[model samples]
Target chain A: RDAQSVLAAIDNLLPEIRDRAQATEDLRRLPDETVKALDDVGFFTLLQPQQWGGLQCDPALFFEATRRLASVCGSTGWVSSIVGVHNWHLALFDQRAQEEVWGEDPSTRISSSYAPMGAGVVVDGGYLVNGSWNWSSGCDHASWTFVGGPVIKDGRPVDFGSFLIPRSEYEIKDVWYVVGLRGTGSNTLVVKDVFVPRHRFLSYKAMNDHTAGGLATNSAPVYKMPWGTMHPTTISAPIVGMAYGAYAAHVEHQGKRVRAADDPFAKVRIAEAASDIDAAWRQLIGNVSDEYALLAAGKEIPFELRARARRDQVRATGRSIASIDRLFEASGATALSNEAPIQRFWRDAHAGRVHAANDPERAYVIFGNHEFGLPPGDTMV
Target chain B: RDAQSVLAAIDNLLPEIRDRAQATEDLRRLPDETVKALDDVGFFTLLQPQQWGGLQCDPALFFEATRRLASVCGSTGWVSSIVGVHNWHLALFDQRAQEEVWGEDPSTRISSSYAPMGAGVVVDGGYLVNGSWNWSSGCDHASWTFVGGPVIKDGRPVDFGSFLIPRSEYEIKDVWYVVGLRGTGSNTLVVKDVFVPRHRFLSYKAMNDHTAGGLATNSAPVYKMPWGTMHPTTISAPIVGMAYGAYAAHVEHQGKRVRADPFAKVRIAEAASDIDAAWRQLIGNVSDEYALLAAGKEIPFELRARARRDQVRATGRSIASIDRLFEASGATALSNEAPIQRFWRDAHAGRVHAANDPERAYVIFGNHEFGLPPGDTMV
Candidate 1:
């Protein structure tokens, strides 16, 4: 019921989602109405554990919803992915922590800036979370921040984790002016000397292993899988969607040309564009299907498989970039104006790739080594 | 006879041709020795009519030879293509003109700038040709040149024809520095009021109907077929070869790498599929129609339309293969010394050729698809 109806609802929203994209991009954030629409359809609940009264749906369905939304508007799909993934990520924390965030408002969303930037001064029973965590996407729409900071001992950062802070504690800095993925509202969250309870701190080790001692309350095994591998998929899905969006836009633009009567190459451009986009989808969708099947079977997902996700994910990123670039290059000078989604999708896809989770060079390097006799490298895989 | 021996001859020269590419590029011309080797192999006779002591080979074999040579050196393949195609292009000219060049030396080579830029001022017996024709590839090795200039009666030009002039009439200027196909020696040819005999003129009229006065001396029938559609394949063949060469170099470079074997494997598999698709199109499309022509079948409209499609698509597909290899090839590909980088540069230069412009290629196929009569002269 959750999977089918939810997808149908998201499907109906695509055209309006497309209509609001320019405004969403212009406003530099998803308008509250579109946010409300996604919320009404339960887009955010796909990854949220059922223990907290949310639809604990399949990972493929989550990607599909985000992908459909991204095809309409990249940043909206991007923000939804971050919001969606963060909801799932929060499920990996201690049960009391989940209860603390959701008790007052089950719909209260959280935003994150994952880099270990802020310093956490370890103290008795709690840590003093201080400094700035940058790139907290969708922060304006959320009530809590799962920002990252280095957990320090004797002035050196020994470890890192998501230090939970209330909206009242950290100040939002509007400094997210960027080239691509502009609508994310990925501003900074500033903390001076906020107290973080021991229950609020989710260790990187716990999150990496999916045994943060929190999922005990929610026996949904989907939440127990490691989040790092899945995190990259969130980035890949939206970018891939942006490429699909560009292809559809170009096709629609070319459909009525006076020259199609005389010229044949427009169809050729359309054909090549179709194949690349389809190939990219096959690989990306297939990549997740493999992982999802393993999770559904309750079989232990191996490092080789996780590394394979990185390999396929990064290539999917490259394929989208290539596909969008092809259509955009032939997009011609007249058609490339601000009115066209082709150029915007092209720019947004490039911007999405700049995220650390989306960087495949190192992932490729690790996968290559694992391909040979070398063991998996330092990243989560 | 020329097709089999000629292919074997070039096949044996592949190692030398590849080994001499940097030297060829450095010299900015197919070295006189390389030129001599191709000449000894009878490479220039593929398209020449039999009456001039030429090979008189099939169009398919002409492309095959050039495609094979291009995989070794783009410029070499390029020089061979121009020389080969032009030889056939000449057989469509008056027989007297062919005798003028091959009369003294049957081995006389020719270069061409076929853009129809020169103005032929009609004189009493011959026309005074005056213009600077550019992009005359392999000019230094050519003894005769087929320069295109519009024939003028009044202020307005009446018609265009390919003007034939001996080596003594024009000066080959050394201005051919380029990124790819550097060894082509595609310099400018300057002519100052040189006289071209009326007998040597190749009319646009006669060429359109295969009555070019010269075809009567040798009715090879292949000469009557429209040169319009087949001309672009000459450019595509070498570029496709460059893509093949890049794939080979990349796979060899990737073999010894210590890490990311799967990624490398992925690239190799993808690159193979891309190149094979391109090669099949490049080779298969040309092979099909040439055989059709030889068998006395009309080159169906759809056949020409699809040939135009694949002719253009092959170049794009080949470039895709090379670009994939160049990127996945790592930082070492940055160095100019590497052959992988050279093949990439060469492939791009060929991709930019006007013959492969996608819009024009697409229009031809689309016109055919919509069941519209052929709107353009091409195909």
Candidate 2:
């Protein structure tokens, strides 16, 4: 399907998803029906390679979909954006790995936990992976998972890679109790001794430099953009959507009940929240489009653009959290209950904010390093 | 002159400005030699119309000049930027108004107080203005001044306009004692019953909507951007420059004495990023508007809203940077010997400009984004 049709389908799902948002939070995972509905509408394959039964649409379209979905249901939007991004990430791996996952079943999905919480010991042709990786979103629906671990050679880590493992090799522990994005089902993955071959693994350096093994065959411009912009953008758009939803809910409630109808102070805050939301989206969309434009021209994404993308991406998430906080604060006592979607938006956005990708200081330091003409202090940029 | 040449000129003047910054503050105005030095280097005519023998460079170039100048001397930077921006503001007036000021001397300067504290009674051709206006920056150096007041007709306020008056019509009161930006001669303008012609009065609505009479003759793309963006940015850039100066001073001092201090390095990184973000966002939004105007496309409401949003936030982030750097620079930083203390004070002083009201500008953006009526009530 085309971009507009994908958006139309997501639009069609909002009423149903919003109504089921509470159940989504209660079950601590998206309902089976919601996943199936999103899957049927081709939501997860947005950034996937076209040859692999996917759309390979503009990155901004993927963000727009996530932002729109998360506006109504933060968990669904969070998982959808993150999981969809993994399809693109998987495509960036060696072509053989792509086939191993999508060859037998084109509808195969993958979830990820990129923190180096596990260990991988370099062996003959593969690495022996062990230990548990936490906060893998949408793990219940995926057939494969990407876990980050350092490759140890001579008892010292020589490299870091995101190891793609099949569902059969790992067990999903029921440990997803959380305050926000509860429906994301971001549980821990317990992995015993399992071997992940080299082809299925992408070193952090390879990913950061856009020299992944899959780039040889994928040939899509989407694969050319740096990891710094793409991954953080996926995390940021959903948080922005939560802010969008909160703003809408607050605006609606105030209009319906005339709460603070004559209070200029409250009106000022509503406006402040709206601007925050607007700035967040504008920067995110603008930065992504800028990166894509450079790639389309077959030009390397400059260091400045990469650093700026990371900076703006993190700032966008922070701004989104700030925006929702404003809306929730002005939303009054009636909005305190879980029944008010505003509270869920606040909780979910704040939770999503703690994700490592949304860390503001790290990204700011990278930007600051570049601006001060310091050497590459961060490989991610 | 081109943008680069203008920046180079400002660079050549920084040392002289820096050496005299203390004396400039002591005088409560820029030294005459400093004023002459800036004028000789073409600092004030950056935004004036070419038809009047002035270089109407890009708005961003003007801001960069201010930011760079403010990095060395906050007072000179404050007055230079404010006076330079007034040239642009004057360009948005009638042809006769432009001639009245710059016709005799293209090197002429103008300073302004835009608080709307005074009143103007409608006369036959213009308005009879009375009452005193405050904070006229660079007033001692200018031959004319712009003051804000409401036009009263039949004992009722009809419209508000910034009234331009020649120096002969008003007296500059020496009332510029302040804690920051002391070199900016922001004194009071005591105007008796003086008449300003219709040609010299620009209604706030005209400026906001880009229908000023000067747009007819002075047809630069710079004139196409809205009042909310242009006016606020003129105030915001100097503040950013102060932060830029503070960051420079802190880095230099730390590099010499505290290279091993990890916390100082982190603070340096934080302050540098804040300054970079503020400058980039300010220029980005203004450049966005400039591009639209150059392409002959209508500036969209969202872009206008974003400009205001980013402009006010630019002032905010700049102050945050100053505050961060000042507190971390140790006890000696508060000494008069250190430039950080001056920058801290000047940055805070710049924040009090009426145009720098963070809440007011933010509300404009939010109002526009929400599709509310009269999105910019302030302008």
Candidate 3:
């Protein structure tokens, strides 16, 4: 599908998918029908390269699709975006590795646990990997997995790479029973003595410098993209979606809600809540749009931009959560019931804020560090 | 019990209470045993007048006790301080009403839902009250409740006042089940055609102006206190306690937590977390102390001072929560669970600030309003 078509399909699926997303928490997993339906719509193939029978759509389109999906269901949007982005990333590998993934099945999806948790030993022609990789979202449905590990050369760890391994090489362990995002099915992937060839290994340093696929595939823009910009941006989209979803819910509920005590002042509070939600949604969209513009222009993504993005993300999340909180308080006592969607959204929005990436202080500190011309800390861009 | 004795008792209970306070979230209710233990230690009777066989401790001492309690449990400290301060308020009522509350049972406690949810109708001698009062913490154990209502006299709403009514006059309804402060059992009290005599109603306006009691009893220093000053101060103490609790938890956990990734600089992150927590704790304590001192000096509690208090409360809560977040991120994944206490406290702290009460902006706006000489708005 083209970028426009992909986004349109996602927008069309939103209402039905919202129902599936609503049931996501109870099922403790993304409903198979939802995943299959999304897959059938070519949602996962948007980021795949054209040569590999994938659309190679613009990154902004992927974000738009993610926002639409996450607005209805956060975990599904989150897992789908991550898995979708990895498809493009995998295509940046050697042609042989790409074939192993999309050769037999162009529609096959890929999941990743890219934290470099396991050990890799140099063998005759490749590395033998053994370890457990946790938080591999969408792994249950993926045909291939990209596991991060250190590559050993001459009995010394020479490089770090994300190894593209077939599903048969690893085992999915059902370990993701969490307080939030339970529908993502982010299980642990355990691999024992899996032999990953050099062709499947894309080095981190290479990705950082847009040097992946070596001099041979320098013409491919997907291979030319930097890891720092792509990874964080991919993760940021779902949260933005969640914020929009919450804001929409708040606006819908507040218009007709009446306080049991019948105070005219309660209407003022509702109006204030609406205004806050509106402000938050605007700021969130503005930040994402600015970042997208910078990326599209092929400019060197500045450190301050990244810091500002993080700051804006946290502020957006905080405002979104605060908006829900105000709505919950202003609504009648019945709004406090456990079964109320307002309450669920309240809890879920808060849970989303606790994501390590969503920490407001860290983002503020990063922005402060940049503003003061201080040295960049160890935070990943 | 004397103030010193009460302090000592709180100290003794700190270790157990802290654990229980943290555990209250899991249990979804403040343990009944904890309330009984507090009552046995005279926690609830601190603010009652001496004439009613109560201690009537100083306001500072009351705040100190509340801060200590809050350092262990948010819900427990909140209920205790609110209920305890209500006792002091009862002292300002007519002697007959005071006696009715404490004279018969000195150990008895009173809960309150003071938002004036109930309506009142004018009657021959007093107002006829009928409605539900929500969030009356400690209602399950209290003998009486202070419900806020509009005073109706001669068929016209005249004023707002808090009415002290016997528990028998109202029915307790289990209503408060929430994400935070679950232990306080802040249930609702449903009243049906309860008749409260004129003496039972204490005018809120009178209290705000320090004119509730007549000239003879007005000389009592406590009655001279402003209601706005007194009520918010009581609420502020528990928040300070929560910040302290979170800071302590962060310090304890950061010392031993190690990063899983060998290449990651874990120690530096730990240092940053510690430094941030310390900065927040120091600022929070200073702000609270300064606000109390300003109030105690008989000065009009300025808006800037209130804004500073609000900012400190927010910063304190945010800093402590950030400390725990960094600790969780830098530490091994298994150590993350230990910081949940801090997270819960942080989340609850975020809820305490009133919407218009964003402290940083308030400080600027208040400063601007007072015209004390314009400063930068960056604060």
Candidate 4:
């Protein structure tokens, strides 16, 4: 199916998500119905390869859908985007791992917590891993997990890689409690000593160099993008969506209030917030399209393009958060009511802003380093 | 001289400029000595062409010097950059106009008030111009004035062009009174019925399309940039410099204080980011434009809109940065004796310039991205 059809399908799914936004927050996880609708709409398989019954559509289309989802419910958008991206990430792993996850059922979901918190010890065939991975969003629905860990050799850390773990090998911990993006269900996972085969582990080197084993099977240019830019973009898209939602609701709210109608202060705040939102969306989409254009041309993606993507991505997050803050403050006491979606969007957006992927200082240094002709101090890019 | 050598000269001239910053403000114009020092150091000629005995160095270096000067004294920096950019603008005019301004003495200065406020009627040989152009900065130091007016046909204003008026043909009206940038000496100019020659008028259509007459003789890529971007950048660079000045003074003033200061530290950090963002965005866009021009490529509309977007945002961000620094600064920061207050006032005054307005630029960018008809012809 074409990307436009997918967007039409997503537009049809928004009303339900909007109706259940409060319920999604109360459960601190997407409701089974919400997940079923998202799945039925093919949102989960957007980035998955066509070989695995996935659309493998344009990333801009996927981000557009995510932004639309988050405009109604931030947690739903956050969870859907964060979890859906793992399909693309899985396609970058060894073909065997991709087969393992989708072989039994192409619809099987995978969740991740890539903080390098797991412990892996070298063994006969692979490393025996044991540790807890925290903030594993959507793990309850996924049959597999992507956990990051350092590979230790002779009691010394050597390299880091993301090890794919099946649901049978790890237990989900019921420890998700948060004020923002509460429905993300970003919980912890405890894994006992389990033997992870070499094929299941994807190293940062292979990912950064665009030499992942899955590339042999998945040759789409979309798979060739750097992980540093793609992952953060997923996080940023939903936050921008939240800003869109906040802006809409703020304008609607102001329309009915006499105070806001005449208050120049309120009017100016509305304009400022709208511009910030526009700027965030433009930068995010523009940078993404820039990189995608290079890849589609079969040209090597340069350091400057990657660094600029990261720069605009992080700034997009900041801009969206700043926009939401402006709207929330102008919204007054009534907006803080639990009945209002504005407060929830504000919370979800601020929560997304703090995600490690959205860190500005680290990303700013990348652009600064590139502009100054200095060495890339950042290894991720 | 190379741009680096010119930068070194600017560095050596900063001490005296810094020393006389307060006096420059009180005098409501740069002191004669400060102007002499700026001229002696070749700040004005940085943008002038080499054929006319100018460095014609990198625009970035010229802006760098301007930012440094503004960091010490906003008015002096404002006048110098505003006056200096006129040289680049003049280079885009007809060759005859360029020679007339610099042929007698290449060091001859030109000031402008391009507000389209003058009235002109089509006459024999040229248009007879009459009207008053306001906010002509550094007029006292110039031998000629660039006045913008709409050319009339029968009784209707038909076309617009910037006319070159010799100093002898126009009268300077002392009307500059303001709280900020008082040192700019931005007076008004009144012209009686004076005939301006045809060769001296540079049409907006010619400048925007990079087909100005001066391009026949002067072919530097620096003159290839759009005035919408280049002109606003001149206004923005000094505001950022004012932020730099405020940041330094605030840091030094806080260094000696014994107050519980987590809030102060946060403001300082935010101010630093704003200042850096302002400068980085400005330089980054200019660098891109320069690279494209140097490669003999036309700057596409998208990149031009991006440049305009960043330029206006830079000015807005610089003003916001200074506002943050000034607000967090204690009561002493408001005192007339303090430099922070002066920088604050001058930076805000600079923002009052029509070019620095952010909304129109933002609209232009949106229109381009949305595939709508172009928002404004200026960009």
* TM-score per candidate: 0.55, 0.52, 0.76, 0.52
Tens-place lDDT per residue, model 1, B1-379, is: 6688888888999999999998988888889998898888888877788887787777778888888888889889988888778888788777788888887888889898877667898898979889998778899999889888789876778877789888898999997765567788888899998888889888777786667887788777567556655678888888888888888888777876744347778878988898888778867877777777778776777877788888888888888888778767654564446677678766765655567777688888998999888777562
Worst 10 residues of 2 chain B by lDDT: B329-338
Question: Which pairs clash in the backbone of model 1?
Answer: A263-B363, A264-B362, A264-B363, A265-B362, A265-B363, A368-B260, A369-B260
Worst 10 residues of 2 chain A by lDDT: A329-338
Q: What's the iRMSD of model 1?
A: 11.2
lDDT of 1 by residue, A123-197 (tens): 888798888877777898998888776788678877778888889999999877665667888888899988888
Best by TM-score: 3
lDDT of each residue in A34-153, candidate 2, tens digit only: 999999898887888888878888898889999998999999999999999999899889988999999988889999898889888888998889989988889998999999889987
Report per-candidate TM-score of chain A alone: 0.95, 0.97, 0.84, 0.97
Pairwise TM-score winner, candidates 1 and 3: 3
Per-prediction DockQ comes to: 0.02, 0.01, 0.08, 0.01
Tally clashing residue pairs in candidate 2: 0
Which number leads on lDDT? 2
Instruction: State residue B144's C-alpha deviation in candidate 1, in Å.
Output: 1.9
Worst lDDT 10-window in candidate 4 chain A = A329-338
Error (Å) of candidate 2 at residue B150 is: 47
* Per-residue accuracy of model 4 over A228-294 as CA lDDT, tens digit each: 8788998999999999999998888888885532356777888888998899998898888888888
Q: What is the lDDT of residue A178 in candidate 2?
A: 56
Clashing pairs in 3: B30-B183
lDDT of 3 by residue, A224-272 (tens): 4445546655666676667567556655676555433444465675667
Q: What fraction of the true interface does each of the listed models get right, in terms of native contacts kept?
A: 0.00, 0.00, 0.03, 0.00
